[PDB]
């Protein structure tokens, strides 16, 4: 029944405590250890060039003002006690919109230690910007980072380090992206200098490899089928003007619709993507097929057989070059 | 171990401090220096005529009530101390929706100085309205501004200036817009008079040049290909009524679909854009091509050869005039 004794101990710690002053104010910088437990990566958006990350953000630092004696236990206090304690001004530099879950209470943990060590945990869902190079899309590889920095305190007042070395960030295997796979993750600690001063920086980066399975069925297969569809006109007799012309028109129009649909699902980038090159190549073959019959119709008022062997061969050669270049 | 001495010094500063009164109340106006560190420009929306801006907003001013002696250091206090200090009522006049990031704490910095100088920094994501002239779209150039003004205090009570002159705003090179490029940025300081009084105004303006690479592939190229597609009917024999008529219909219908799709991605402006003029011109050529065969069919129940040389030549002339006018 030492709850009163614990209450007296905690009240003594908070008596005269100044939240406005960091631990060891005016002296050596306070070292803050950080570990991240990744819950999931909900979305990866190419149009907005950002990803949504949910994680458990733990911060580890020692505050001698909170040291207590006579209690051989780690005091796990209510999350509302964090308002009366100094906490690092940690923020994410590249985030676009973040929040802390508050159901049924704020997703916050405070755990004191006899030596003054403070454990501060937060469950944060953050949307962090990630610039993407879509030149090799959809066969591209992306590197999305999460920048962690102190906002007000410089390196003279605070220092950041990954607690546990390369094992600071866990839960990477929990990431289940339908479109991407986590090839590798890295931890970087460095100092970044601004006009106000030099600030400690922690960076967490993931290398994402896009899955080609969806795009083969969605885009590449329909484009090939339309190109094969245009080859049917070669076997049709030249006197069937309505049939062969209709086949050329529909394949060309269908190719345009596929190309327009793809570009509407991606940001309006000026450079040409890998998928755009394939669609442009497919459009050339179907357009040449319709031009081939126009040449046949013009001379008539052997050529078809020559077209039956060149177009499938050239298209196969085009596919071989395209896939080798981008793989 | 002078934390108690610092605590006594800070408590003395805030004892009797009145947040309701500006520094030097009833006397000379307080000069506020402002610097902006641009983080990124996330979006530029033509439909909503606004852009999203993330930046570090720093305010510099001197408050003699906060001057302290005996501490040869700059007191970097917790961000929660800003609630007990007077801050300028700075607001953005042209913003539509703005907020201050609050993860893991509010993105706010307070840094006092021995002479009473106060540094106040905020990380703000703002959506500022920007009226756009789309007459030359997509070859247009846009000038988006960010208006900074005091809400309650007039020029007799507060003054704004860019701290550092033309170097007040940094991070412009960090802006990576896929559709726009930052040609130039300007800093303007002026006074704006309302009924309540004259107020200090700071303006930050960017000149944006749109990238034509996306629109060439998305819109201009399909329009040209459809126009070339209509020219195939000239080489088709006139007796193939079904083939030539089908060619004319499909090109006309496809041109309409392209025109409708483009206008759905832009605000419902009454004036004609540059891209609209090109689409209207392309529609004329394909419509005339179908009318050309109707004339040929009518006279039959030489003209085709004359059409084979006029339409490509006129279309090339139309393209030359169009591009020279808008470049």
């Amino acid at each position: 029944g030492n709850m009163s004794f614990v209450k007296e101990t905690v009240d003594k710690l908070l008596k005269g405590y100044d939240i406005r002053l960091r631990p060891d104010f005016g002296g050596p910088p306070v070292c803050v250890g950080m570990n991240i437990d990744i819950a999931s990566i909900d979305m990866v958006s190419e149009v907005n060039m950002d990803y949504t990350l949910t994680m458990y953000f733990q911060q580890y630092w020692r505050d001698k003002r909170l040291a207590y004696s006579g209690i051989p236990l780690n005091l796990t206090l209510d999350n509302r006690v964090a308002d009366q304690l100094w906490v690092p001004d940690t923020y994410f530099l590249n985030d676009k919109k973040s929040f802390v879950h508050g159901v049924t209470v704020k997703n916050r943990m405070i755990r004191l230690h006899p030596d003054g060590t403070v454990l501060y945990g937060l469950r944060i869902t953050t949307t962090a910007a990630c610039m993407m190079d879509l030149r090799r899309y959809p066969l591209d590889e992306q590197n999305c980072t999460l920048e962690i920095e102190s906002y007000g305190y410089t390196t003279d007042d605070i220092e950041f380090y990954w607690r546990g070395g390369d094992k600071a960030v866990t839960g990477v295997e929990r990431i289940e992206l339908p479109q991407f796979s986590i090839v590798e993750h890295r931890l970087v600690s460095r100092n970044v200098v601004f006009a106000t001063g030099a600030y400690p920086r922690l960076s967490l980066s993931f290398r994402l490899k896009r899955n080609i399975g969806y795009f083969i069925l969605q885009t590449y297969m329909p484009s090939i089928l339309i190109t094969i569809l245009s080859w049917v006109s070669f076997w049709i007799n030249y006197d069937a003007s309505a049939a062969r012309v209709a086949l050329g028109i529909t394949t060309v129009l269908t190719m345009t619709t596929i190309n327009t649909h793809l570009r509407e699902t991606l940001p309006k980038i000026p450079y040409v993507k890998a998928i755009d090159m394939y669609l442009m190549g497919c459009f050339v073959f179907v357009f040449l097929a319709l031009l081939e019959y126009a040449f046949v119709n013009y001379i008539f008022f052997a050529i078809d057989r020559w077209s039956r062997i060149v177009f499938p061969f050239t298209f196969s050669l085009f596919n071989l070059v395209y896939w080798l270049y981008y793989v | 171990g002078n934390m108690s001495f610092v605590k006594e010094t800070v408590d003395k500063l805030l004892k009797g401090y009145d947040i309701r009164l500006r520094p030097d109340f009833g006397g000379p106006p307080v000069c506020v220096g402002m610097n902006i560190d641009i983080a990124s420009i996330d979006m530029v929306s033509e439909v909503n005529m606004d852009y999203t801006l993330t930046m570090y907003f720093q305010q510099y001013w001197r408050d003699k009530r906060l001057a302290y002696s005996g501490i040869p250091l700059n007191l970097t206090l917790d961000n929660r101390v800003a609630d007990q200090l007077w801050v300028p009522d700075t607001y953005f006049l042209n913003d539509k929706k703005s907020f201050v990031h609050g993860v893991t704490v509010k993105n706010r910095m307070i840094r006092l100085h021995p002479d009473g100088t106060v540094l106040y920094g905020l990380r703000i994501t703002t959506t500022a309205a920007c009226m756009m002239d789309l007459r030359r779209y997509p070859l247009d150039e846009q000038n988006c501004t960010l208006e900074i003004e005091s809400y309650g205090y007039t020029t007799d009570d507060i003054e704004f200036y860019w701290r550092g002159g033309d170097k007040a705003v940094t991070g412009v090179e960090r802006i990576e817009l896929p559709q726009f490029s930052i040609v130039e940025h300007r800093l303007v300081s002026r006074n704006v008079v309302f009924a309540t009084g004259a107020y200090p105004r700071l303006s930050l303006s960017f000149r944006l040049k749109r990238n034509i690479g996306y629109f060439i592939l998305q819109t201009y190229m399909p329009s040209i290909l459809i126009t070339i597609l209509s020219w195939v009917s000239f080489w088709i024999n006139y007796d193939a009524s079904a083939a030539r008529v089908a060619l004319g219909i499909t090109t006309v219908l496809t041109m309409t679909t392209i025109n409708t799709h483009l206008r759905e991605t832009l605000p419902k402006i009454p004036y004609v854009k540059a891209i609209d003029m090109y689409l209207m011109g392309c529609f004329v050529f394909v419509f005339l091509a179908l009318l050309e065969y109707a004339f040929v069919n009518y006279i039959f129940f030489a003209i085709d050869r004359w059409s084979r040389i006029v339409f490509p030549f006129t279309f090339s002339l139309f393209n030359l005039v169009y591009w020279l006018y808008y470049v």
Epitope: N191, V192, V193, F194 | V172, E173, R174
Partner: nanobody
Amino acid sequence: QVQLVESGGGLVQGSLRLSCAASGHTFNYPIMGWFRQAPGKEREFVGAISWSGGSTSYADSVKDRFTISRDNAKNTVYLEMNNLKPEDTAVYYCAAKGRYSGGLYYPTNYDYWGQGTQVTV
């Protein structure tokens, strides 16, 4: 991983054009900077430019005298030094900066550096 090679120095009494070729993961480092280090003096920022958009910044000393531009076809950033002065005698370096590495003017924010060319007038 970005490799930087610079050339085009020499000794002159004039107009000179430095150049810097980049190779590797240039997308992760879209900002290229130019630095010079006088003997005994600390390394000095000259100018910076982005790979995309061509936005550029310059120091006051070299303002209106040095022009910086790049071509993405060759992945080359070139510094054009016109109206040279005796104060412009230092080893010119080429550097690349990360997307979230901070200010341009501070050399410590740059990760990859070139060999450096000595220019004396």
